[PDB]
Amino acid sequence: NAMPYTWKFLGISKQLSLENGIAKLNQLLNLEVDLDIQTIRVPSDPDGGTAADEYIRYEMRLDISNLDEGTYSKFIFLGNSKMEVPMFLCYCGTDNRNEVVLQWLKAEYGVIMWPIKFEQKTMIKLADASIVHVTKENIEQITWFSSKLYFEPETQDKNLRQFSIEIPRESCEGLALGYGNTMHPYNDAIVPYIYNETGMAVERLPLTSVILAGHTKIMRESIVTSTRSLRNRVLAVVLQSIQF
Amino acid sequence: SRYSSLVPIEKVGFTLKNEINSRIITIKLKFNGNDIFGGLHELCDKNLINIDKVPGWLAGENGSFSGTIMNGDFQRE
């Protein structure tokens, strides 16, 4: 729609060294998969223990049609060898070869994978991660988005089927100013403000989505974006979320 | 039954505005159902909502009417 890319996530039992090589999958698919590999840092300001905070980001684009965006198909992997669960992957699009890429990873590497699901607190952390902008000088900056939290409780006779809490852009910023400077405004300022003002504990309620207007929609089992990709920090939070 | 209301509300909205360090902070709450305040009643019982922190206006004190609450003063519309 305004957010045509729907991402699903999978934990992986080992850090895949795709560096070498996509070739085997390429011929399987009789198709040219492009493989990009970069090292990223989260937090980004490279002054952060020149390591540990370094991740490896891999991307596989399935080269194909460009008519309907709902079929745009990309695989993203984030790895960190200094973590116990050292990699996850996620992928968008509805292409039939998606499932064929998964079974290949398994075989080629003998790895097991599992669907990643996000608890409320992680949905919150992902919201904090999504609104970080990285300048050219690799400085991380919070940016402000009108924000909306949706809930779908289970009550007798559908008495209460749905409710939402919306915080306009200016009030998200405003709430952070009372805190004040923070890279985690949803966790540190906004979600607590809601609890203290309403008795509603977001992390305990049936939160089904967090929508950052025009940007991303974070849900229990997926993330939807208007961008054909996910931000470094959002990826880092996903990976941290599956550790023990 | 157990949570029904004499006059069930199916749609209601509240805008909460508080003045914090001379800045106005706004949040907007919206509810949908067959009987909203009954649903809210159940959630408070199941402890999913903390009833001691539930302001009067959210608990229905005037329920039936959507409105704006400005520094603790409810005004329907």
Domain segments of chain A as ranges: 1-244
Instruction: Decide if A35 contacts A22 (C-beta within 8 A).
Output: yes
The structure was resolved to a resolution in Å of 2.3
- Quickly list DSSP for A164-187: EEEE-HHHHHHHHHTT-S-S-HII
Residue A22: enclosing H or E segment and its boundaries? none
Domain that holds residue B67: 1-77
Q: What is the Cα gyration radius of chain A?
A: 19
Instruction: Decide if A93 contacts A75 (C-beta within 8 A).
Output: no
Return d(Cα A160, Cα A150) in angstroms, integer. 13
Residues 6+ apart with CB under 8 A from A212: A127, A130, A131, A145, A146, A147, A218
B76: three-class secondary structure by DSSP: strand
Both tokens of A203, joined, read 């992390």
Instruction: Decide if B3 contacts B38 (C-beta within 8 A).
Output: yes
Nearest chain A residue to B34 by CA distance is: A159
Return d(Cα A201, Cα B47) in angstroms, integer. 10
Instruction: Decide if A212 contacts A147 (C-beta within 8 A).
Output: yes
Both tokens of A115, joined, read 């669907």
Return d(Cα B35, Cα B41) in angstroms, integer. 10
CA separation (Å) from A155 to A235, B6, B34? 35, 17, 10
- Which method was used? X-ray
Residues 6+ apart with CB under 8 A from A1: none
B contacts of A166 (beta carbons < 8 Å): 27-30
CB within 8 Å: A159 and B42 = yes
Residues of B near A (Cβ–Cβ under 8 Å) read: 1-4, 8, 16, 18, 20-21, 23-36, 38-40, 42-44, 48-55, 58
A contacts of B39 (beta carbons < 8 Å): 153, 155-156, 159-161
**Min CA distance, B47 vs chain A (Å)?**
9
Both tokens of B54, joined, read 């539930």
Nearest chain A residue to B55 by CA distance is: A198
Q: How many residues does chain B have?
A: 77
Could you report how far apart the first and last alpha carbons of chain A are, in Å? Answer: 36
For A28, phi and psi rounded to 5 degrees? Answer: -50, -50
